[PDB]
Amino acid sequence: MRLNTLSPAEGSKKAGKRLGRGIGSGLGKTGGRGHKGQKSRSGGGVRRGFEGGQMPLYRRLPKFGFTSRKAAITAEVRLSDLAKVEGGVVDLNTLKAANIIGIQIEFAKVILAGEVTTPVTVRGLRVTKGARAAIEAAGGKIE
């Protein structure tokens, strides 16, 4: 274990394509680019979603919907996070003290996503029908 004895793992370092360096490398004289077109030029290549000049798929199709501005301020609390809220009382503001939801969140929902184990107290949140049947199955009261 000296400085001249340390090796990488096998396959951890691939070499890297060196283009335009002769016949034996398999990358000479075109650089893997083929013959004369737009895509073999320096900087050539069309932009994203170009189809030729056919109407592109993201312009062939209709826009739909709107952004809610209430889905940005809501989050979901898995049941895995009901043990980390530091006090057994899941408020909105105590989920932020444990860095579970996010500081700009006004509404949280507790969903059935895994193993509530402890006496917990959800106050001021929404819970689902599965999560209500699991919090009370471990001895928890929802306000």
Partner: protein, 201 residues
Amino acid sequence: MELVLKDAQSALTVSETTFGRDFNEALVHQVVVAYAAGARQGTRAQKTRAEVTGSGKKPWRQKGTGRARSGSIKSPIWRSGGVTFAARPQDHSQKVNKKMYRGALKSILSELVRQDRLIVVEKFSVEAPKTKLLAQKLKDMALEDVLIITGELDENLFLAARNLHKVDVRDATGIDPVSLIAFDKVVMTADAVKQVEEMLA
């Protein structure tokens, strides 16, 4: 594990996770290279065709003269103009995860007790800040290329190895990948191996 001292023969207790881990070479090679690349002072640059001193005047006309077509005296095909992909000063640092950095150091210290290059002392200090005494310090200790790692701020010992080339003194918080490998013996005071065991958990 256990770490037998130099002469008191009373082996202090270390956690076997830090000094008896299996060696991971791909982990230690990555953190010894990222130490080596993060030591690069990436300070160089060349001139592109923009930056070469010259005029943007086309040298001859495009047609008519039987010379190859040119449009700048600063093109990289030309002598004294233009590096094609010229260098800029860059950052050659790498990111190491903390659990990769700590896993490497736990795997180097585990290997130093395997190849018997870790010697733990209980005190390593020298009375006068004199290189002559420390030059003696390791003859009885039978050391020539060594890294001393202490826990205290000994400035008497620190100056006494500032001239000795193969002797390095640290402070148990700045020990690194490449320093734990490039020295033949690593000698640690017992207050220092308490701290190093701690920071690597």
